[PDB]
């Protein structure tokens, strides 16, 4: 949602309206309340795009923690956005080593959620806490309560 809600912030009302209707007819031949392969393919072969039932349902699995289970209007649109050339690819690992390192205020190579949340206080803006512990888990896939550089990487996904 983080990436996703932050995204819906940008594009305006009319973008929202056009893809709502684009779903209202993306169900012109719908499948599952979500969109299983028939409408997806329908709309695509109307032009020629290539989503496959398998990876359809998989990128769904990547996202259907909501309980869409298959390509809902949400997945229809995340597919939509999964194509437009806008941005990706990860502020420098050298940069990121620095960024870890300042998370590694301690000058160690291992960071608990404490000086990390203190980096966050150093960010100051309205601090969420759920997402703080979530980010602890993101990083500490090592799960050692303290976080290394690549854990920090696992902790700062999709970030500028």
């Amino acid at each position: 949602d983080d990436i996703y809600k932050a995204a819906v912030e940008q594009l305006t009302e009319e973008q929202k309206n056009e893809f709502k209707a684009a779903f209202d007819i993306f169900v012109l031949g719908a499948e599952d309340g979500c969109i299983s392969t028939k409408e997806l393919g329908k709309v695509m072969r109307m032009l020629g795009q290539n989503p496959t039932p398998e990876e359809l349902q998989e990128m769904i699995d990547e996202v259907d923690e909501d309980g869409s289970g298959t390509v809902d209007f949400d997945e229809f649109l995340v597919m939509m956005v999964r194509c437009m050339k806008d941005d990706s690819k990860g502020k420098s690992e050298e940069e990121l080593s620095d960024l870890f390192r300042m998370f590694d205020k301690n000058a160690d190579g291992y960071i608990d959620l404490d000086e990390l949340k203190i980096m966050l206080q150093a960010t100051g803006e309205t601090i969420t806490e759920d997402d703080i512990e979530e980010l602890m888990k993101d990083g500490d896939k090592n799960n050692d309560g303290r976080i290394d550089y690549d854990e920090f990487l696992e902790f700062m996904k999709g970030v500028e």
Partner: peptide
């Protein structure tokens, strides 16, 4: 976008 949206594509 063009070939199947035409001049209707202005803001959205």
């Amino acid at each position: 976008m063009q070939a199947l949206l035409g001049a209707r594509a202005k803001e959205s």
